Design a protein around this motif. Structure first.
Motif, PDB file in Angstrom:
ATOM      1  N   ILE A 202      10.694  10.593  -7.299  1.00  0.00           N
ATOM      2  CA  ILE A 202      11.712   9.546  -7.279  1.00  0.00           C
ATOM      3  C   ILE A 202      12.968  10.108  -6.627  1.00  0.00           C
ATOM      4  O   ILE A 202      13.608  11.015  -7.174  1.00  0.00           O
TER       5      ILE A 202
ATOM      6  N   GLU B 119       5.598  -1.395 -15.123  1.00  0.00           N
ATOM      7  CA  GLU B 119       4.496  -2.079 -14.468  1.00  0.00           C
ATOM      8  C   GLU B 119       4.691  -3.590 -14.543  1.00  0.00           C
ATOM      9  O   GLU B 119       5.122  -4.098 -15.584  1.00  0.00           O
TER      10      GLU B 119
ATOM     11  N   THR C  20       3.683   2.895  -3.870  1.00  0.00           N
ATOM     12  CA  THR C  20       4.992   2.953  -4.506  1.00  0.00           C
ATOM     13  C   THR C  20       4.982   2.114  -5.776  1.00  0.00           C
ATOM     14  O   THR C  20       4.568   0.950  -5.755  1.00  0.00           O
TER      15      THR C  20
ATOM     16  N   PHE D  10      -5.312   9.681  -3.612  1.00  0.00           N
ATOM     17  CA  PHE D  10      -4.411   9.005  -2.692  1.00  0.00           C
ATOM     18  C   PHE D  10      -3.387   8.154  -3.429  1.00  0.00           C
ATOM     19  O   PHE D  10      -2.753   7.286  -2.819  1.00  0.00           O
TER      20      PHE D  10
ATOM     21  N   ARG E 221      -0.527   8.855  -4.375  1.00  0.00           N
ATOM     22  CA  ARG E 221       0.803   9.033  -3.808  1.00  0.00           C
ATOM     23  C   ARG E 221       1.066   8.092  -2.642  1.00  0.00           C
ATOM     24  O   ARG E 221       2.222   7.956  -2.226  1.00  0.00           O
ATOM     25  N   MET E 222       0.031   7.443  -2.105  1.00  0.00           N
ATOM     26  CA  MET E 222       0.190   6.532  -0.979  1.00  0.00           C
ATOM     27  C   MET E 222       0.840   5.213  -1.370  1.00  0.00           C
ATOM     28  O   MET E 222       1.213   4.441  -0.480  1.00  0.00           O
TER      29      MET E 222
ATOM     30  N   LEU F 274       7.370   1.083  -9.481  1.00  0.00           N
ATOM     31  CA  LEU F 274       8.719   0.946 -10.009  1.00  0.00           C
ATOM     32  C   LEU F 274       8.837   1.741 -11.301  1.00  0.00           C
ATOM     33  O   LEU F 274       7.959   1.665 -12.167  1.00  0.00           O
TER      34      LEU F 274
END
Ligand SMILES: [Mg+2]
Lengths: 257, 342, 114, 71, 237, 231, 155
Positions: free
Chosen positions: D17, D69, D45, D40, D42-43, D47
């Motif tokens: 972040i 979420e 985004t 994957f 990390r691919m 909140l």
């Protein structure tokens, strides 16, 4: 270092103020004190950075899109706006200090009065002035700026800003006060503006706006309180619009020669 | 007050566009539609005394300025702008000119800027040699020599000390050497000599060209051809020479082939980066041409007539020293042109 | 004197640093002072260092160790990315708090021998 | 989210972040996009909510987050 | 390289050409160079003082100047081996310039590592124009930064308001914290006030970082897939 | 009064004084007019760039000294000045650029607009191998005659018939024209493809906007291949 | 920091985010969790219960109105207008929730005026900080302590 620009006929301004608008004390507050206050704060904010070598107008454009540089944007916008206001209300832009000229009769040009009729559905300049005074009293609860602006379509229209809102860049016009309640029509305008700013492909998220100011009136307490007092800002705006320097205002309208 | 004057023209300009637009409309219409009907009218019309006036006034007016005329001979700014209609929005070109108007008047309202360095002013507004201070030299970075690991100990007498792993050049000596070098440039310029400015490091061209322009001198920014001075007839004989008067105006006299092959040797050579121009320095020695050069801590001082101790790696330091020398030359040139007038 | 001026020069203001410019361990805070050049000076490769930075560099931010070296180059990396980490922390508007409830280090408190 | 499996020996995952690596605590369950995306993850985004920020003696910042979420 | 002779004697070599008649016409530079002689000594010069700290170079303390016992409790009665070595080299070696402010600068940025992340412009404007009154920390013309603290500390020790450098340094540090806190609030409040009057911003700093990370994470996705397929085939071998 | 001989050009001591002087003159213009915007028709790829040849520039740019990279640098600056918006350009720029335009403009062009004849017919000639074809295209209903004979009679191979129809199939106008084709020389393939080439060239008069589609299909290109004497 | 008109408030968050029988017990409902500082601009109020959600409410009207005009046009929703409006609405809500519930109110305890009208006449253009220093030395803390609610000792 950003320094306060020297004004034409400054000795007269420090003795008799601006006739029909401000007194000597009133003009010392708006310009000789407030402009010094703004420039010093701008110098402290920008010294040691790349922005120190740019004029205030360029600083506001460079920083208009940066949320955490709003403080620098506010100072640059106020400095530019204040000299736009002090310039069109000034007795004479030329320095008749050694010529002792006391005859400056400036009147709206034909191009200005032709664009007024075209953009205001045939309304006269006097009627437009009344709309400007009304807009200031009902749209600017506190500090702000009143502008007569021209857009890319050759149309003159009235823009009001809250606190230090630039007329050049619509995302930072600050024309809607969100502290109070807003209508669905005002929210639509804000929502449409947000969509336009999101269509830009630039990594700086900046849009193109070609609006330019023609007349500037300072609606801050630094300009009217001392001479008019709380509640009499509409008498101040009336005097300003009636004693404008039209040699400066006419030159701000693009002619094309 | 006088706007009508322009309005009178614009009126004609608009009318001209209307006449041209409908001249092209009649260029499409077939002749069969217009010609026979037009001729028939004349067959049904009778010329009057007045009509005949124009029958021959236009014949001559068209036989004088259209047929028997010379087709050739043996609001000035932006004169090709196509203004848009008063109802239509501004064109891209008009918006550019509308912004230029704002840039001149309004864009600079609010404050003035003082005590801020602008790189271009080093080239266009160099100070006079007498007004240069140690502070000014230091602000330009002239004191920053090379790494102490690269020290050429023959420069020992110019060194003020070492700091942060580099040798600090003594600006008090730089100022004295700079003033002496500047006086030499002024003397040669006032005497009418050829001054060549040599610098082959990236970015130096702009300074080199302006220095040559304001001293009526010459410059080389790309490459010094080895032999330019010692082998001048094989390199520079082909290029053109010219004769000039005491005011540096071309006399226009044609030059004999004998005068156009003779070596034209510089009277003074200024070298911005001597460590990369050994060839030029050695040719200057062989050709007995006095030379000025910026001598960094790793550079050999004795190879030049008038060394200037100083940083040769920074464009600011180089352009600051070059600017001072260029203005000194300019003053010499102005003093020579003034003595000719009076 | 020249020595007094040098001590106050902008180059003197940067504290000596020989920490590796290419560090592959754990990074917790900035290690090098970011140097910034204005657009006008960048056009002329002027950074206020000893020598001109190569024109290939298009960034306006760098970090360096040595003004000059025996290899006749400046030791620098054309990056200034720790400033964006600080500005992004500011945008999150989360104040830093002490998990031990210690006195605020930025205030001159009257402490005792507790 | 950097890893698709909580930090080994720790009950919290790691998130990236604003140029800082934080420890993310989930309400109760881990969103199903984790298993789906895998390494994957990390691919994408997500909140987050930043609970607190602390400073350790090493000079690091201990940022604690919460995987907000859509609900 | 040998000390060159021919570059500084151009005037004398030229004068021989003119006197003999080998060169008919005097060059334009000839008179100018004659009036402004070149410097031709090219000598190494001794130095007897460090300009930065005023330390004297080339002074030997004689045994007569050390009458009292040393830290070991012994008197000095004869010159030591170091005193008997010629030290001419020290007269010619460029002195190492040192400054007390350098020590404080290293301390400040060790205590405040994130101050390094605030970009500094090394390009000078005009050192000669700086008219600063260090009775206060803020100055018109320069940013508020670590150097503001160091100069304030020096003024305090120079005016003798504080005796120990540490005490003056701490006093300056707190003045720096106060100014830093007033600026952190002016920026937060300015952003908040602008949004409350209808200011719109395209991309925030957090958003800018996300976009940049996506560009990198997209190239990384392709390569990972490619290199996780070459491995599978290569391993099949 | 006293006179002296000096180098004419400030760049005299450079490798190519003539080229550097010309580059400096153009660079001054690009600096004086840095602000002037460039053409937005550059995206439209305006077809105007008649600059002198490398050999022609060598007459004025140093002759043998002239290097190809130096000529490339001249073109990058001539084009940049040329691409300034025509409305906002000035005389100075045009004056400097005039000297670098090919002098072929001295004369005129040799192309006259093609038009339908008195009977509405577009006449074009085509050649393939040793064959030639002269076709008459008029607006009609798809009737074709080859040397006065029916298409199926003159051309027995269906592939030859399909070749003739291809240009009309590209513009989807197979039933919009009547074709009177006359062919001589070579064999069936040369004649059929010579007719194909001639129909494509005759169809451009009816709608010049379809030339690009005809060129892209390959029917407006003259096939150069012919029988080669073995060498 | 406030540039124009506004007020700096010392507020006390009300620990009654339940909304059940709210504002029915002048003591059980007057309980403060933690104190905070809040800035209001022009005619803004420090309460936050009568003005929160305003933008979210207007945002939902705009989307519904646009969605109903889209239905008249006959469009197949969009790829990311349902995922963007959803995110905009999900953030608008999550940023106004309370610790337990979404009824977060504030009890005014103190207020300092930032308007130039107050301090420009006596202190001048450069004397706002002098005004704020004398304001701090002029606060009767008795009146503020009086307004202070009773602490919520749920802990
Ligand atoms: Mg060097």
């Amino acid at each position: 270092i950003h320094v306060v620009p020297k004004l034409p006929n400054s000795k007269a301004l420090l003795q008799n103020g601006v006739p029909n608008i401000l007194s000597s004390s009133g003009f010392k507050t708006v310009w000789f004190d407030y402009q010094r206050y703004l420039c010093d704060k701008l110098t402290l904010a920008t010294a040691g950075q790349s922005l120190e070598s740019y004029y205030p107008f360029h600083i506001l454009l460079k920083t208009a899109g940066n949320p955490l540089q709003s403080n620098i944007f506010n100072l640059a916008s106020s400095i530019h706006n204040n000299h736009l206001f002090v310039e069109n209300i000034l007795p004479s832009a030329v320095e008749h200090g050694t010529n002792s000229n006391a005859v400056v009769k400036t009147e709206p040009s034909r191009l200005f009065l032709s664009k007024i009729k075209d953009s205001f559905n045939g309304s006269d300049w006097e009627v437009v002035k009344e709309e400007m005074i009304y807009r200031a009293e009902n749209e600017v609860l506190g500090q702000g700026w009143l502008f007569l602006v021209e857009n890319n379509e050759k149309k003159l229209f009235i823009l009001t800003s809250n606190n230090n809102g630039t007329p050049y860049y619509f995302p930072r016009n600050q024309s809607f006060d969100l502290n109070s309640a807003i209508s669905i029509d005002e929210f639509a305008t804000l929502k449409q503006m947000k969509e336009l700013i999101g269509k830009s492909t630039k990594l700086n998220g900046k849009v193109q706006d070609w609006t330019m100011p023609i007349i500037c009136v300072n609606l801050w307490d630094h300009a009217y309180l001392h001479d008019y007092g709380v509640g009499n800002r509409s008498k101040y705006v009336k005097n300003v619009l009636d004693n404008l320097n039209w040699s400066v205002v006419n030159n701000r309208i693009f002619s094309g020669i | 007050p006088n706007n009508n004057d322009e309005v009178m023209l614009l009126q004609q300009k608009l009318l001209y566009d209307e006449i041209r637009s409908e001249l092209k409309s009649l260029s499409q219409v077939p002749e069969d539609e217009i010609l026979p009907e037009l001729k028939k009218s004349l067959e049904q019309d009778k010329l009057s005394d007045k009509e005949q006036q124009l029958e021959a006034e236009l014949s001559d007016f068209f036989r004088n300025y259209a047929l028997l005329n010379k087709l050739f001979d043996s609001t000035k700014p932006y004169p090709n702008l196509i203004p848009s209609a008063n109802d239509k929005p501004y064109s891209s070109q008009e918006l550019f000119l509308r912004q230029l108007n704002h840039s001149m008047r309004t864009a600079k309202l609010g404050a003035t800027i003082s005590k801020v360095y602008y790189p271009h002013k080093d080239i266009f507004y160099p100070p006079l040699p007498e007004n240069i201070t140690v502070e000014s030299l230091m602000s330009a970075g002239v004191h920053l020599g090379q790494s102490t690991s690269l020290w050429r100990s023959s420069t020992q007498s110019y060194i003020y000390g070492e700091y942060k792993g580099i040798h600090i050049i003594d600006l008090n000596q730089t100022l004295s050497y700079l003033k002496r070098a500047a006086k030499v440039v002024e003397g040669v310029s006032e005497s009418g000599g050829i001054i060549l400015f040599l610098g082959t490091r990236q970015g130096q061209k702009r300074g080199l060209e302006e220095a040559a322009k304001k001293t009526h001198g010459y410059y080389v920014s790309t490459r010094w051809i080895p032999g330019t001075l010692t082998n001048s007839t094989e390199i520079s004989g082909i290029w053109e020479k010219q004769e000039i008067d005491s005011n540096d105006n071309p006399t226009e006299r044609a030059l004999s082939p004998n005068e156009t092959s003779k070596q034209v040797k510089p009277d003074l050579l200024v070298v911005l980066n001597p460590t990369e121009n050994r060839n030029a320095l050695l040719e200057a020695i062989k050709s007995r041409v006095p030379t000025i050069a910026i001598i960094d801590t790793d550079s050999e001082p004795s190879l030049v007539t008038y060394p200037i101790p100083g940083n040769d790696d920074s464009l600011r330091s180089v352009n600051f020293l070059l600017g001072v020398l260029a203005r000194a030359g300019q003053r010499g040139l102005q003093n020579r042109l003034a003595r000719n007038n009076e | 004197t020249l020595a007094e001026l040098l001590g106050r020069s902008r180059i003197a203001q940067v504290a000596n640093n020989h920490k590796p410019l290419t560090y592959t361990g754990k990074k917790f805070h900035p290690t090098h002072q970011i140097i910034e050049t204005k657009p006008s000076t960048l056009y002329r490769q002027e950074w206020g260092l000893k020598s001109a930075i190569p024109s290939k560099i298009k960034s306006r931010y760098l970090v360096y160790n040595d003004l000059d070296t025996l290899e006749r180059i400046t030791t620098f990396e054309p990056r200034g990315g720790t400033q964006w980490n600080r500005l992004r922390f500011q945008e999150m508007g989360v104040p830093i708090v002490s998990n031990i409830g210690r006195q605020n280090p930025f205030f001159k408190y009257i402490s005792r021998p507790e | 989210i950097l890893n698709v499996v909580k930090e080994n020996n720790d009950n919290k995952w790691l998130a990236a972040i604003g140029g800082f690596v934080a420890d993310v605590v989930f309400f109760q369950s881990p969103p199903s996009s984790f298993n789906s995306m895998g390494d994957f993850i990390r691919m994408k985004t997500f909140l987050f909510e930043i609970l607190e920020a602390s400073m350790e003696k090493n000079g690091s910042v201990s940022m604690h987050a919460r995987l907000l979420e859509p609900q | 390289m040998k000390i060159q002779t021919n570059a500084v004697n151009v005037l004398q070599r030229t004068s021989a050409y003119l006197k003999s008649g080998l060169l008919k016409e005097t060059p334009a530079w000839y008179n100018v160079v004659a009036s402004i002689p070149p410097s031709t000594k090219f000598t190494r010069e001794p130095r007897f003082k460090n300009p930065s700290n005023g330390h004297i170079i080339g002074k030997l303390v004689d045994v007569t100047e050390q009458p009292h016992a040393n830290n070991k409790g012994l008197y000095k009665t004869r010159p030591n081996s170091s005193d008997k070595r010629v030290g001419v080299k020290r007269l010619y070696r460029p002195p190492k310039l040192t400054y007390v402010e350098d020590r404080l600068r290293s301390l400040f940025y060790k205590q405040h590592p994130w101050e390094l992340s605030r970009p500094k412009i090394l390009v000078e404007n005009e050192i000669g124009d700086e008219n600063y009154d260090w009775s206060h920390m803020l100055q018109i013309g320069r940013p508020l930064d670590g150097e503001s603290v160091i100069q304030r500390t020096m003024y305090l020790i120079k005016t003798k308001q504080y005796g120990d450098m540490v005490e003056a340094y701490d006093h300056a540090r707190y003045e720096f914290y106060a100014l830093r806190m007033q600026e952190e609030t002016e920026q937060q409040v300015a952003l908040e006030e602008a949004e409350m009057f209808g200011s719109l911003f395209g991309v925030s700093a957090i958003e800018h970082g996300i976009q940049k990370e996506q560009e990198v994470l997209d190239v990384w996705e392709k390569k990972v897939v490619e290199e996780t397929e070459l491995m599978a085939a290569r391993t099949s071998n | 009064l006293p006179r002296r001989i000096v180098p004419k050009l400030a760049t005299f001591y450079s490798a190519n004084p003539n080229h550097e002087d010309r580059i400096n003159r153009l660079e001054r213009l690009l600096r004086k007019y840095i602000k002037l915007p460039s053409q937005n028709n550059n995206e439209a790829q305006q077809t105007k760039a008649p600059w002198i040849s490398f050999d022609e520039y060598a007459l004025i740019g140093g002759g043998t000294k002239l290097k190809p990279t130096q000529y490339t640098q001249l073109l990058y600056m001539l084009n940049k000045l040329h691409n300034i918006d025509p409305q906002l350009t000035n005389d100075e720029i045009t004056s400097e650029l005039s000297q670098y335009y090919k002098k072929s403009s001295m004369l005129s062009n040799n192309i006259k607009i093609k038009t339908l004849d008195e009977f509405g017919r577009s006449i074009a000639v085509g050649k393939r191998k040793s064959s030639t074809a002269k076709v008459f295209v008029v607006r009609g209903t798809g009737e074709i005659l080859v040397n006065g004979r029916q298409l199926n009679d003159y051309f027995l191979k269906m592939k030859d018939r399909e070749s003739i129809m291809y240009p009309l199939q590209v513009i989807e106008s197979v039933g919009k024209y009547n074709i009177f084709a006359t062919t001589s020389g070579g064999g069936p393939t040369g004649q059929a493809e010579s007719i194909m080439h001639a129909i494509a060239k005759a169809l451009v008069v009816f709608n010049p906007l379809l030339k690009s589609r005809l060129h892209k299909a390959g029917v407006l290109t003259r096939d150069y291949r012919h029988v080669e004497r073995k060498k | 920091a406030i540039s124009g008109d506004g007020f700096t408030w010392l507020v006390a968050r009300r620990q009654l985010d339940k909304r059940a029988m709210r504002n029915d017990m002048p003591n059980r409902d007057i309980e403060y969790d933690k104190l905070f500082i809040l800035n209001t601009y022009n005619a803004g109020t420090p309460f936050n219960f009568s003005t929160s959600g305003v933008m979210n409410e207007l945002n939902n009207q705009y989307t519904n109105m646009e969605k109903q005009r889209a239905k008249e046009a006959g469009n197949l929703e969009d790829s990311e207008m349902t995922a963007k409006q959803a995110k905009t609405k999900f953030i608008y809500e999550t940023q106004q929730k309370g610790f337990s519930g979404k009824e977060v109110s504030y009890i005014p305890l103190l207020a300092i005026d930032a308007s130039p009208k107050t301090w420009l006449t006596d202190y001048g253009v450069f004397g706002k900080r002098e005004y704020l220093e004398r304001v701090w030395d002029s606060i009767e803390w008795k009146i503020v302590e009086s307004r202070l609610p009773q602490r919520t000792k749920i802990q």
